[PDB]
Amino acid sequence: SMPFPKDCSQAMLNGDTTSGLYTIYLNGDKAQALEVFCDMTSDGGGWIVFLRRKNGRENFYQNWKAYAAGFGDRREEFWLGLDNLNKITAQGQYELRVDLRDHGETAFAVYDKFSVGDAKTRYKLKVEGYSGTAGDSMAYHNGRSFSTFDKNCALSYKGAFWYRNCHRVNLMGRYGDNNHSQGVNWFHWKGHEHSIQFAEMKLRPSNFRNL
Ligand SMILES: Fc1ccc(CNC[C@H]2CCCO2)cc1
């Protein structure tokens, strides 16, 4: 096992093959301990889950400080936080996976290259290298800074994202809200008038597929 695993891939290969809560260490630094939910089953596992939507019990209409730091319940609905995502994606080349499920249908999207800038970039999104079945809805968002109501689409649509003008993805939107662009949307799968029941965003090293 690796004493201070810096993501859910290093934490898995230690043998641990159950999805659940695990401790990771940013830059492998024992002083930068982070609790994450590892999805160890989806496409060979080793994923840090950074968003989960599944029942609308948690409020995602939260401020910049809340999106930077993280919020909610890692076992249920949560946001891991942008400072975390910046530090994780700085450790090497990460891939993004999005898993969607709504009234029994499933779709996914993988981006070979995924990173989040530091606070000085307003946590700039980078997503390149699409494959999957949900449709390339993040390409629209590539290069966008993060937006919350207090730093305008977040206020217009009552959510938070790497907004442009405004979104094809709104996975931190209002739960079960089918009003145009207000819900948990992945436009190129279910459009802007269908709020998705279940959504996870997760990352692991892009080189995991053949490590
Ligand atoms: F994924 C996440 C990441 C962060 C959080 C909020 N952390 C709260 C701090 C202060 C009191 C306890 O920890 C929730 C879910």
What structural keywords apply?
211 residues; 9-stranded antiparallel β-sheet; alpha+beta; 5 helices; 14% helix; binds the ligand Fc1ccc(CNC[C@H]2CCCO2)cc1; 2 domains
Helix and strand topology:
Blueprint: H1 8-12, E1 20-25, E2 33-39, E3 47-53, H2 64-69, E4 71-72, E5 78-79, H3 82-90, E6 94-102, E7 105-116, E8 125-132, H4 153-157, H5 187-190, E9 198-205
Antiparallel strand pairs: 1-2, 2-3, 3-5, 3-9, 4-5, 6-7, 6-9, 7-8
The protein binds ligand AXS.
The ligand Fc1ccc(CNC[C@H]2CCCO2)cc1 binds at residues 70-72, 74, 78, 80-81.
PDB class: immune system
Keywords: SGC - Diamond I04-1 fragment screening, PanDDA, XChemExplorer, fibrinogen-related protein (frep), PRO-inflammatory, damage-associated molecular pattern (damp), immune system
Assembly: monomeric
